[PDB]
Amino acid sequence: NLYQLMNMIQCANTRTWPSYTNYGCYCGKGGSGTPVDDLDRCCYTHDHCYNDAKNIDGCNPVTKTYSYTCTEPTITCNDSKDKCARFVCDCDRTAAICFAKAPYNTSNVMIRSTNSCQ
Ligand SMILES: CCCCCCC(=O)O
Numbered sequence: 589n590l591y592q593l594m595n596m597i598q599c600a601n602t603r604t605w606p607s608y609t610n611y612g613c614y615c616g617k618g619g620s621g622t623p624v625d626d627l628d629r630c631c632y633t634h635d636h637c638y639n640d641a642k643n644i645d646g647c648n649p650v651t652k653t654y655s656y657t658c659t660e661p662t663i664t665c666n667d668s669k670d671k672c673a674r675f676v677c678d679c680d681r682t683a684a685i686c687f688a689k690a691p692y693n694t695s696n697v698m699i700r701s702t703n704s705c706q
C-alpha cells in the first residue's frame with residue numbers, strides 16, 4: 589500500500605516523505621537512465637520488486653493492503669497466507685531499510701529529465 593509504504597519510510601529513517609518523492613533517476617513514479625547513487629539504486633530495485641509483484645494474480649502493489657508492524661525503527665511483515673500481501677510488504681520493507689542506510693546527496697534532488705536519466 590502506497591500509504592503504508594510511507595510509514596515504513598517514516599518508521600525507519602530521519603528523512604521525511606517529500607525527501608524521496610522525486611530524487612535521482614528512479615525515486616518517484618517510473619524510472620529512466622542509470623541509477624545515480626545508492627539511494628537511487630534503492631528506488632531502482634523497489635521498482636523492479638513492484639513489477640514482479642504484479643505477476644501475482646490480483647496483485648497491485650500500489651494499492652494492496654498488507655499486515656505489518658512498526659517499532660521505531662524495526663518493521664515486520666506479518667503476512668503468511670496472502671502471497672501478494674507478503675511479496676509487496678517485503679518490497680516496501682526492503683526499500684525503507686535501504687533508504688535509511690543510504691546517504692542523501694542534495695545535488696541529486698531533482699536531476700530528473702535533466703539529461704543524465706536518458
Ligand atoms: C511517485 C510517487 C511515489 C513514491 C516513490 C517512493 C520511492 O522512491 O520508491
Ligand code: NA
Pocket residue numbers: 614615616617618619631635
Ligand atoms: Na520509479
